[PDB]
Amino acid sequence: AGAVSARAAEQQRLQRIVDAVARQEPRISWAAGLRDDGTTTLLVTDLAGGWIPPHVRLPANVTLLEPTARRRDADVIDLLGAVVAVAAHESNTYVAEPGPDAPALTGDRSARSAIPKVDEFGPTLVEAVRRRDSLPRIAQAIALPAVRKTGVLENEAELLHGCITAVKESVLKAYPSHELTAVGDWMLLAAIEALIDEQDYLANYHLAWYAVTTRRG
Ligand SMILES: [K+]
Numbered sequence: 450a451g452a453v454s455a456r457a458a459e460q461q462r463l464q465r466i467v468d469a470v471a472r473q474e475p476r477i478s479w480a481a482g483l484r485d486d487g488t489t490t491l492l493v494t495d496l497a498g499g500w501i502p503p504h505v506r507l508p509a510n511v512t513l514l515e516p517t518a519r520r521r522d523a524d525v526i527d528l529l530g531a532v533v534a535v536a537a538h539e540s541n542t543y544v545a546e547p548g549p550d551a552p553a554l555t556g557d558r559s560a561r562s563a564i565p566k567v568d569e570f571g572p573t574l575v576e577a578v579r580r581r582d583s584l585p586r587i588a589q590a591i592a593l594p595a596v597r598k599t600g601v602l603e604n605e606a607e608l609l610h611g612c613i614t615a616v617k618e619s620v621l622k623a624y625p626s627h628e629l630t631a632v633g634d635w636m637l638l639a640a641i642e643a644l645i646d647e648q649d650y651l652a653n654y655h656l657a658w659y660a661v662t663t664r665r666g
Pocket of ligand 1: 488489490491510511512
């Protein structure tokens with residue numbers, strides 16, 4: 450009595466969460482699952498081992514995969530691991546326009562703040578920029594000012610965001626045959642932008658994911 454309705458509500462909640470991020474970025478695959486504790490909702494895409502790109506806002510109360518090296522070929526189902534309910538979105542499927550029941554996109558701060566502070570955050574970012582040949586000039590120009598918190602010019606913030614948008618489009622158009630090289634650049638640029646916006650925990654999130662994305666064998 451009422452068991453079907455409760456089970457249905459649980460599955461429908463996961464699908465609304467998936468469709469909420471999918472309609473923001475439908476060109477990549479997504480999945481969400483409920484852990485056996487009954488309270489942890491895990492959200493993944495296979496773009497880069499569990500990293501969530503910055504232009505996607507997250508529903509409330511979702512949990513992300515922690516930054517660890519994961520195999521390139523794992524699909525969204527494999528990335529969820531052990532769960533008791535699953536919903537997914539295949540890349541390039543059409544997603545309906547949102548209605549009143551769409552989940553509120555308030556979950557970015559909590560979801561992306563679960564990573565401990567990277568050791569020597571500032572020097573680590575500057576070293577990463579130094580050793581990356583593929584970065585645009587704006588990254589070399591304001592990496593150290595962003596770490597020193599001296600402030601940058603508006604045209605420099607505009608150029609940085611223009612380069613973030615460009616690598617986003619380069620990567621998502623090459624998906625699923627994208628180069629993790631370009632994804633790493635996307636992550637480093639995203640860390641710089643969060644830094645100049647005083648969102649240091651976001652810069653930490655992107656820097657931590659950069660390290661596992663660019664790790665050697
Ligand atoms: K959760």
